[PDB]
Structure 1
Amino acid sequence: MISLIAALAVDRVIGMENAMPWNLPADLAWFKRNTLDKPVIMGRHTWESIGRPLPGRKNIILSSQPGTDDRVTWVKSVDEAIAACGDVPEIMVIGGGRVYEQFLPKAQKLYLTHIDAEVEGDTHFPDYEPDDWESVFSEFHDADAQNSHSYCFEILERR
């Protein structure tokens, strides 16, 4: 199966200027926990923000254009990307915008990080529709020394 993994602030805002308007070390942690050992599909922009491969996971990139780091596997099509994974039980789609937009429909599970912060952003998340999804997991956390905002994890299966 396919899965999207994202962190959303208030208004489904996912980021500003090739960045994330926040800093939650704890999300990264949860993020990694959820991805370790699985293939991650990302996009040229996302990729560019990461800047280096992600250890323990198969880094697949989407670019219309030519691969520019031999360390990571590049692709020119959703189908390619999807191909590039293989016989795995779960493929993780890690962003950004456009990519989410495109795989949402194929997804069957979501790992969300609801961040309690109202911030302006230029990229929002694909509008999912409640009806379809069944929240099967939540986990709250208050802001801290390091995670300046409170946040909540959630897991939803497509009903």
Structure 2
Amino acid sequence: MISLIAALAVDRVIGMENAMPWNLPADLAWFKRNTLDKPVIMGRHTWESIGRPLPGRKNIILSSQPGTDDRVTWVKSVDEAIAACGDVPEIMVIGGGRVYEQFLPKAQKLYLTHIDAEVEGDTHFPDYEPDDWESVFSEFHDADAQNSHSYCFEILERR
């Protein structure tokens, strides 16, 4: 099954021209917890943003352009990306916008981090129909000594 994992600010903003203006180690911990030991599929821009391969995961980069790093797997189609995953119970799609749009239709679950941040965004998470998804987990947290904004973790399963 395919799952999408994303951090969304108000109005579904997922990316800006520069790094997102928040400091949320709790979100990174949640992301690591939910992606460890699974293949992760990402676009080139996300890859460049991370800076290195994510440890303990099979890193798959979906891009039309050619591969710049030998430590990860470079693919050119959604179909090739899927095949590269092998026989695994769950494949995680980590962004960005375009990638999420291409995988949404095939996704059965969403792991979402809603962040109370108002920002002008460049890219947005695709519009989902809340009537088509069932929230099976939610947990709210306020900003604290280490997290700059309040956020809420949510997991949704396709109805």
Counterparts of residues 122-137 of structure 1 (less than 5 Å)? 122-137=122-137
Question: What runs of 5+ residues in structure 1 fail to find an aligned partner?
Answer: none
Q: Residues 134 and 103 from structure 1, CA distance in 2 versus in 1: closer, same or farther, beyond 3 angstroms? A: same
Counterparts of residues 31-110 of structure 1 (less than 5 Å)? 31-110=31-110
- Deviations along 1:43-64, whole A, 9 cap, x unmatched? 0000000110010100000111
- Deviations along 1:60-103, whole A, 9 cap, x unmatched? 00111111100000000000001100100000000001000110
Question: 1:35 & 1:130 partners in 2: Cα distance?
Answer: 24
Aligned equivalent of 1:9: 9
TM-score by length of 1: 0.98
Shift of 1:21: 3.0
Question: What runs of 5+ residues in structure 2 fail to find an aligned partner?
Answer: none
TM-score by length of 2: 0.98
Residues 136 and 156 in structure 1, CA contact (< 8 A), matched pair in contact too: yes
- Deviations along 1:106-131, whole A, 9 cap, x unmatched? 00000000001111111111001011
Residues 132 and 158 in structure 1, CA contact (< 8 A), matched pair in contact too: yes
Partner SS, residue 11 of structure 2: coil
Residues 18 and 45 in structure 1, CA contact (< 8 A), matched pair in contact too: no
Displaced runs of 4+ in structure 1, greater than 6 A? none
Question: 1:28 & 1:142 partners in 2: Cα distance?
Answer: 16
Counting matched residue pairs gives: 159
Residues 18 and 49 in structure 1, CA contact (< 8 A), matched pair in contact too: no
Shift of 1:18: 5.0
Query: CA RMSD for the aligned pairs?
Result: 0.8
Question: 2:126 & 2:77 partners in 1: Cα distance?
Answer: 19
Question: 1:6 & 1:19 partners in 2: Cα distance?
Answer: 15
Question: 1:48 & 1:153 partners in 2: Cα distance?
Answer: 25
Question: 1:43 & 1:117 partners in 2: Cα distance?
Answer: 24
Shift of 1:20: 2.2
Shift of 1:23: 1.8
